[PDB]
Amino acid sequence: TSLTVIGAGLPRTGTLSMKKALETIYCQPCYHMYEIILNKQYDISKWQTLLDIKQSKTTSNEILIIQNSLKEILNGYIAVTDLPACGFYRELMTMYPNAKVILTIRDRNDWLTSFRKVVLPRTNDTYKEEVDKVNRILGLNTEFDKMNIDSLKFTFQNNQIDFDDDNNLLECYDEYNKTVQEIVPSERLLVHKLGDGWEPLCQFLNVNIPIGITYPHVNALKEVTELTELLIKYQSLDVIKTKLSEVFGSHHH
Template structure:
């Protein structure tokens, strides 16, 4: 199975909803941050990819037809080169709403204390911190800075990917633009909605998460 869809959008732009939608449309399985935690050893492999700037993508993403969210979105350039026939979806949303969401969810998770390096969950917890906090934003305390990184990332994707290969997509627009881009019929059922800010916060509050 070869990767046919590359999600280039940052987390908190509807990436889990997109994952579920792609799987419903037949473009799955779709890799997402959640899959890091269900695949032993993957967190360390993404850490290695971050350190090296590349990876054996065929092996790391073996069995997946699409990939969205961090960590794959961090490597959208490498993936776009490795899979030249894959289409790219840049999930976007209102920038202030995006900031409010990430500042209430992913950023607090990056501030939590880490376990010692010999803890079996260390790689899973430190990988997002290395990739998102240090590798993407540098610092997450200043809204203007964070939004500048968001804007620059989206602009870079638009500039690098030819228009026919790229869909800039807000999941609130539902099935129609996504299905038109992928050339598939619009399903009868509602577009999947998942991983709201409150759902994310509720997970963070669970002991051991």
């Protein structure tokens, strides 16, 4: 039960819905950034040393350790979508010859606005302290941000670029999606546009369309922000105690 699908789509291109559509088909786990956050936070440093290696170019000896860490991380998983893995799709291809590649795309301008509200907001965007704060509540360190911005640099194949540049991102986003359709043979690749549904995915994977189930539409703007402000408003039990001792505790002043 090794890798069968490689999700090269970038964040906010429908990577969680694709994840869920693959687990419905194969009934096996699919890797995702939310796996790291909610279950395997110990994989952050692994992905980091893997990204440190790719900062410089790799000796043949170097790449075998890359392939040996990717097998460790992705063992037991049938597929992989989202960052930081979508950037390693070339290494995953040579490594799993019987694995196909799916590329989720959407309108480049719709992606940017979404990409700015959820993933990486402009460092002046007031919504910065919000995304960063729920990270702290979930136990995400400075090294998480490190591993996240670095994986972006790797996926776009650019040592650094001013990420506060909307047009720069578009040029990187358009490039990446273009270079994926060039490096990967058409017979091994599928380009899944938002809303394509089961038919293409299932024909390209040679499986039955799941019966009675509807193609996922998860991780929408509405639900990501609602869950965000829900965690910001969350109250630790230790916090509830302090607020109770001011109502009911003996009052000193």
